[PDB]
């Protein structure tokens, strides 16, 4: 049978970028015709493999990572990037083999008065390593100041809300991102293109 790409791309709700989702796709036949052939995708860049060549290769596991960021942050979902998203929320490796897909989801993820459900990690001590997911909600400390879970001095909350509103500029509008990672492991071929 086929691979459930529809469950990820046509999902009614995405995860926040700090807690980005991962769908493990195995033991199915995939068709990358329909994907490149849509016209609702504003970003479609592939790294290490052509999008029309995927119908001819076999991989062992195909990972589908999905989350939501604003438009200006879409540039950071690429190998060898820096910024708040690339360093603290979702890091791609420098030798990333796959495609990055994103589309304007302002019709879905922004609310009048602000949709404060989509968050992102603003503070972290060291950079995320490739494909790392930090879901901690511990109060970040910059030094050594008593506080006790009270948002005071040198004791703030690490996550930050987007507050997507529909009248925002496209740089601040929500963008749904699906990251397809093609893991050609040494193993039995489970996911081939056809």
């Amino acid at each position, epitope marked *: 049978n086929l691979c459930p790409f529809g469950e990820v791309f046509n999902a009614t709700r995405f995860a926040s970028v700090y807690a980005w989702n991962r769908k493990r796709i195995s033991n199915c036949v995939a068709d990358y015709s329909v994907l490149y052939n849509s016209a609702s995708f504003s970003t479609f860049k592939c790294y290490g493999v052509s999008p029309t060549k995927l119908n001819d290769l076999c991989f062992t596991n195909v990972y589908a990572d999905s989350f939501v960021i604003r438009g200006d942050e879409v540039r950071q979902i690429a190998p060898g990037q820096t910024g708040n998203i690339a360093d603290y929320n979702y890091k791609l490796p420098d030798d990333f083999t796959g495609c990055v897909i994103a589309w304007n989801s302002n019709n879905l993820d922004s*609310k*009048v*008065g*602000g949709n*404060y459900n989509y968050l992102y990690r603003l503070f972290r001590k060291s950079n995320l390593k490739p494909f790392e997911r930090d879901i901690s909600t511990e109060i970040y400390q910059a030094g050594s100041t008593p506080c006790n879970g009270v948002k005071g001095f040198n004791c703030y909350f690490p996550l930050q*809300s*987007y*507050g997507f*509103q*529909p*009248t*925002y*500029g496209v740089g*601040y509008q929500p963008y749904r991102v699906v990251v397809l990672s093609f893991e050609l492991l040494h193993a039995p071929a489970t996911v081939c293109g056809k």
Partner: antibody
């Protein structure tokens, strides 16, 4: 762009106050601007009531939240205001302005309407 | 929830520079906006994004920001200015709020 207010100028106490604002210089159906209501009692400060969008969702004051509701009509290019259970502290001049929200904290009222005075008194 | 605080009265002699301040915990995550309202008239926007001039605004008006306090600065205050001036902002929970209002008087 111009905004015009419409509605009765007198409301008895504890009643529903209805007001309709009509714009004529652009389009309410635009995806870049809100449409709000602002009041000020005579010789007092300003007070924002609620801003509505061309869809339907809107947000209002914490204080005036239960007895307030806002509607829109893209067909007639106009939005309205409803204030249930009007006491006499509601005696004020009601303006309808145009609301711009570019980034997360950027929120201003670009062109105001001249405003109508509704005096609540039995 | 928050409150925008501004003085109710500011006096200046002709030609001098008037300075109106507006402060609040809101002004952390928040910008500020300045409106001039003449007696029996709708307010008019004067300052965008804390410190910017729209088209119909002459260069004599300037805005500044300092921590939790924004400042509307009118240079060469003339008689054409005497009015009530208002600051405004809109927090995380989407609470769009006004200050109390400052009445400018040209001390004649």
């Amino acid at each position: 762009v111009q905004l015009v207010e419409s509605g009765p100028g007198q409301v008895k106490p504890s009643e529903t106050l209805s007001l309709t604002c009509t714009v004529s210089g652009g389009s309410i159906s635009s995806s870049s601007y809100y449409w709000g209501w602002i009041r000020q009692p005579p010789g007092k400060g300003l007070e924002w009531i609620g801003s509505i969008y061309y869809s339907g969702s809107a947000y209002y004051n914490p204080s005036l939240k239960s007895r307030v509701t806002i509607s829109v009509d893209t067909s007639k290019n106009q939005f309205s205001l409803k204030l249930n259970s009007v006491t006499a502290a509601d005696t004020a001049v009601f303006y309808c302005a145009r609301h711009a929200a570019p980034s997360p904290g950027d929120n201003w009222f670009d062109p105001w309407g001249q405003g109508t005075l509704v005096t609540v008194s039995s | 929830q928050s409150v925008l605080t501004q003085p109710p009265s500011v006096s200046v002699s002709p030609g001098q520079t008037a300075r109106i301040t507006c402060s609040g915990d809101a002004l952390s995550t928040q910008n500020g906006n300045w409106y001039q309202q003449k007696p029996g008239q709708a307010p008019v926007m004067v300052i965008c994004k804390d410190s910017e001039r729209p088209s119909g605004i002459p260069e004599r008006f300037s805005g500044s920001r300092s921590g939790t306090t924004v400042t509307l600065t009118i240079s060469g205050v003339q008689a054409e200015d005497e009015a009530d001036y208002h600051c405004q902002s809109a927090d995380n929970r989407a609470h769009v709020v006004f200050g109390g209002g400052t009445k400018l008087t040209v001390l004649g």
